[PDB]
């Protein structure tokens, strides 16, 4: 299957004397592995998964220096945007970036990503060709022209096709055992009267990674109506939780089954209300 | 390793 690396960066300007807050988070296959935060007592990139302990001090020092450069880049970019949009001095504004690569199991780049948002709206993005830009509004046309003129896409392309790919591959080799780790969901169904109707709620607890699917069915057909799902949520101890519910007739509860699909399981779980 | 931006916006 594929693999991915992403860096998600945010800079938030602050109306008083403070410089913008700058945070950068790296992910490999959607697992956080490094983080930098300008508000930390000692602002530096830090490992966030145990396999990043293979990197020497040079790695951390130079990545930290890179973040310090990004911090200035974001500061200037925020100030420039303030002018482009004619915004007043004493507000707070958010610039975000997503960058990275998707890599096949043959180590071929499938897609590179380099895009930005301002105030929660898409701003500019590098096209799939890694050569041209899509700009969302008037301000972003200014940026687009500046980057076309300076040849910025060529430099991003080099990062995406070279460094992004090569480092992802190194991280996957060092992180393999950790990246394969799973914790299986523990599941059960609860019963909650609701008018001759009851809510059946199928719980999945203590699972890792977060990816999971819960389904309800009746008489071999998967349900969609009368259904409620909560967003998958952290327990706070590194594992996750989720539930899914259906509203059913009083007296027919046992006819309904919940299925839990998760990569940790040797096969999907099937369960029923069992009072 | 992280990306690094070139020209400012």
């Amino acid at each position, epitope marked *: 299957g594929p693999h991915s690396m992403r860096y998600f960066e945010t800079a938030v300007s602050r109306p008083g004397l403070e410089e913008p807050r700058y945070i950068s988070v790296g992910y490999v296959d959607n697992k956080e592995f490094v983080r930098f935060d300008s508000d930390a007592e000692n602002p530096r990139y830090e490992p966030r998964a145990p396999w990043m302990e293979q990197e020497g001090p040079e790695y951390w020092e130079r990545e930290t220096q890179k973040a310090k450069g990004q911090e200035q880049w974001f500061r200037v970019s925020l100030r420039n945007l303030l002018g482009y949009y004619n915004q007043s001095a004493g507000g707070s504004h958010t610039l975000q970036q997503m960058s990275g690569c998707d890599l096949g199991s043959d180590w071929r780049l499938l897609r590179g990503y380099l895009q930005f948002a301002y105030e929660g709206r898409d701003y500019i993005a590098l096209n799939e060709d890694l050569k041209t830009w899509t700009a969302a509004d008037m301000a972003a046309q200014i940026t687009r022209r500046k980057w076309e003129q300076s040849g910025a896409a060529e430099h991003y392309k080099a990062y995406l096709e070279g460094e992004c790919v090569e480092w992802l591959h190194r991280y996957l080799k060092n992180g393999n055992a950790t990246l394969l780790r799973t914790d299986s969901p523990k599941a059960h169904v609860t019963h909650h009267p609701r008018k001759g109707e009851v809510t059946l709620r199928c719980w999945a607890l203590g699972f890792y990674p977060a990816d999971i699917t819960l389904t309800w069915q009746l008489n071999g057909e998967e349900l969609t109506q009368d259904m409620e799902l909560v967003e998958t949520r952290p327990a706070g101890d590194g594992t996750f939780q989720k539930w899914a519910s259906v509203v059913v007739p009083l007296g027919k509860e046992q006819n309904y089954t919940c299925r839990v699909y998760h990569e940790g399981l040797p096969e999907p779980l099937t369960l029923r209300w069992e009072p | *390793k992280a990306p690094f931006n070139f020209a*400012t916006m």
Partner: T-cell receptor
Amino acid sequence: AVTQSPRSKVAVTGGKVTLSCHQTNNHDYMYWYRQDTGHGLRLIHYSYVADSTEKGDIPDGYKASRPSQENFSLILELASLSQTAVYFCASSDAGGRNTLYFGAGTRLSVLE
Amino acid sequence: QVRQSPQSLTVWEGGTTVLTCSYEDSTFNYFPWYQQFPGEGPALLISILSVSDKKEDGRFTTFFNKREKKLSLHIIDSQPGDSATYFCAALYGNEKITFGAGTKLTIKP
């Protein structure tokens, strides 16, 4: 544009010297470099934003001032014979790999 | 970290000038050359990324050799107006540029 002032300076040992640089690039980064008998470009001080400065590789004997975005000055409080050299100011955009735009240089001789 | 020799070089007008540089840090991935005429400041001449072997612009070609950590600048049909000091330079990522000591080139007939 990046323009330096003066074009040339002759100072006495122990005298005060200020070299000035003015840029119209609206660039956040400014730099002062030293060149010796036409070789090298050694970074003395630089600045990432108006109203602050950072030590470069060879700061000793020099100070810097960034009073505005457009201006960056190099200050020698007690000029020494060893500071006879040519000094170049530059600007650049913030970020990575942004081209340095240099001024035309200031030649300094420090005399007894 | 960036080693540039010789200090000065003369080559005949019409000849091809070969300027070379080496570097220590194998992670360096951007290599701009700057040209500096007498009485003037340096200015960007040509640059190359480590993904490429060469970059050509008119009479000037830079070649990059990752295995040997070597760069060079070739100038075809070298002419008097190419007389200048050439600085090789190198950096990784968004780190600050490191310049070589510069080679002073004189083109003579």
